[PDB]
Amino acid sequence: HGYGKHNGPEHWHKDFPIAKGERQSPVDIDTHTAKYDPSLKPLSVSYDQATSLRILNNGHAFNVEFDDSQDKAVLKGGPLDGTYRLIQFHFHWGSLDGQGSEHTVDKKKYAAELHLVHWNTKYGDFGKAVQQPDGLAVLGIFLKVGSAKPGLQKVVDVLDSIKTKGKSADFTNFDPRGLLPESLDYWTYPGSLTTPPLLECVTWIVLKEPISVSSEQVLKFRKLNFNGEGEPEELMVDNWRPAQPLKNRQIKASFK
Numbered sequence: 001h002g003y004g005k006h007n008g009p010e011h012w013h014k015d016f017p018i019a020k021g022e023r024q025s026p027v028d029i030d031t032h033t034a035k036y037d038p039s040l041k042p043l044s045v046s047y048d049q050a051t052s053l054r055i056l057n058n059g060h061a062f063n064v065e066f067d068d069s070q071d072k073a074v075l076k077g078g079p080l081d082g083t084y085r086l087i088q089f090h091f092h093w094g095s096l097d098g099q100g101s102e103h104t105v106d107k108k109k110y111a112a113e114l115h116l117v118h119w120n121t122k123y124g125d126f127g128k129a130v131q132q133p134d135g136l137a138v139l140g141i142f143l144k145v146g147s148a149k150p151g152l153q154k155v156v157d158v159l160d161s162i163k164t165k166g167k168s169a170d171f172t173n174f175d176p177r178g179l180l181p182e183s184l185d186y187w188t189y190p191g192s193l194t195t196p197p198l199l200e201c202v203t204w205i206v207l208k209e210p211i212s213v214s215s216e217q218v219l220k221f222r223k224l225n226f227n228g229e230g231e232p233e234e235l236m237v238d239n240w241r242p243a244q245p246l247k248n249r250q251i252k253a254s255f256k
């Protein structure tokens with residue numbers, strides 16, 4: 001299962017029937033049909049004690065992993081009940097600046113999309129959380145090409161050391177607060193993981209405000225490999241799933 005022409009997202013349903021489910025992600029966000037919901041609370045992001053451990057090329061993307069054995073970096077408030085711990089973040093990007101994001105806004109695609117994955121502490125661990133309808137909370141942040149994002153450069157510089165699938169590198173003292181936009185206004189809806197096993201266990205929180213990265217920064221994403229060392233080289237690009245039907249779901253907005 002990958003993003004190629006013979007094993008891309010359009011084939012996934014064969015191994016994972018839930019791919020054609022009722023709350024699949026990503027989706028197109030229609031800003032004019034999103035419902036303003038005054039009952040929604042502001043997001044509470046507490047990343048000040050975050051402990052990054054490692055960066056890994058898993059063949060789908062690269063993951064920056066965090067210590068989630070304590071409430072060090074947590075997400076609360078918003079549409080969430082309870083405390084969600086940060087476990088990892090990763091990106092989806094395109095082969096061109098005009099595509100790469102998974103979610104779209106009024107059909108507009110962005111250059112890339114950042115996913116910060118958190119799990120609901122009441123379920124004890126990530127593996128158990130994914131089996132629950134309220135197990136995960138994923139914070140989605142759009143990337144557009146323009147000015148460089150200083151807080152992203154540490155990630156970019158290390159990519160050379162994890163070029164191929166299975167490669168990992170120590171990655172300590174990275175502060176994820178450097179990746180957040182100024183405003184935390186958001187849309188929220190119930191959805192799924194966007195890669196297999198595509199479990200419908202995610203509360204999506206998609207920030208309205210994109211961050212800017214430079215052409216050179218996103219360019220270095222595109223030099224990674226889907227393949228492992230010694231195998232024929234396949235550039236890691238367009239690792240994004242297409243928008244899925246909204247079906248019986250309403251997208252809510254924390255702003256007007």
Ligand SMILES: [Zn+2]
Nearest residue numbers: 090092115194
């Ligand atoms: Zn993702």
